[PDB]
Amino acid sequence: TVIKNETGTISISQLNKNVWVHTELGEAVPSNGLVLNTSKGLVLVDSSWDDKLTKELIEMVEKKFQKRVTDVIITHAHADCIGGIKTLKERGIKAHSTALTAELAKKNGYEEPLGDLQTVTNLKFGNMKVETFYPGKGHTEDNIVVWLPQYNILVGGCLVKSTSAKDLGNVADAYVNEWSTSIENVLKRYRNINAVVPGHGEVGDKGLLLHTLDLLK
Template sequence: MKALNILLIIVISLLNLNCSSQKQEVFKPKEVYKSNELIVTQITKNSFEHTSFLQTDDFGKVPCNGLIVTNSNEAIVFDTPTNDESSGALIKWIKETLHCKINAIIPTHFHDDCLGGLKAFDENDVPSYAYFKTIELAKEKGFAIPENSFRDSLVLKVGDENIVAKFFGEGHTKDNVVGYFPSEKIMFGGCLIKELGAGKGFLGDANVTNWPATVESVKKAYPDVKIIVPGHGQYGDNKLLDYTINLFGPQTSRPTAASPK
């Protein structure tokens, strides 16, 4: 009996030690690069939010987010910074600080805050991938054009892991796609997803009627998502999906807020 009691004490001690170790391993987000035009924030062990700025007539200087995911010295970037200069700085930082090869750049829709710095990626021989409608709209508007198109969804390797880019329906634009990094359960929602407290923002290319159903589809596809990075503003959890659904749902008849978000 005494031996059994000693064994139980050892097991309990090991369990407590393991729990303590897990608590200590919780990642604390930190800013890892900052200039006047570009900020990079590490938000998980292998994922980084990049934020650049777009000068607009209606909303002033707007911060615009993208996402970098890494694995085994490889990286994939969702959305370019807003111009070639900021994109060049981001590419340099990924190569020299993270020591990663950039496997792909994926603009999540055709606006400047997604592909405004695409030329810099082209000049650095980074393959670009976009939903076929994004390429059509970029051509129509005379914007930089991604090289490779996909329909419905795209799966690419980053090191030993996969990323997914998928079109769920119209919302902010006709071509908005969502990026997902399953190994860290992190989503790049782009401008389809709003930060908590945001207004409806720019609706010039939007399908407001379909927007809530599109986000509902995103929510059903990724029930285990832990972190969501919106196109503008603060990242959060799956509450961002519910907030966006309610913002554009039939019960919301309030006018568009004077906000770029």
């Protein structure tokens, strides 16, 4: 099932019982994130392009689940992920991030996140388990991946390209050479992966990681 906004710029698709994928368009470019419905509120993985879209996304999910968004995990310091940091902070939403992401955010003129995530961080919201992992430099110097151990679902972010993507994207701030090693670190860490969510594009499987390594070759 998929719910959208009149405009069409924002949609939320269900992956399973308490896991949904949110997608917003930034001529227009899509960006994926996750919406986690827990017994203690909603938790998002990444916000949106800007404050207008981010606020809209929040209003949408809060209305649907009749709960508040309590936390957001920021996977890197680019607009498509930290675009609405100001909205989150004025709503009492905790914006988790690594210390590195926090400093790059400041440096990119964005209000900065908590900078609390370590290389390996395990968070539990109600009964929903979430693990954050920094695999090394790649698409960006600070990119991290998110893992849901109860579903073996991996949020790759922009470290992972979708099946039909033939372009790596903006590599001005990327570490192309290191990117491959970082993806290998993810593969070595998570042996049995089911679904993989790309920065943008359709949800796939481990094949997406191999596809990205192929592009980097």
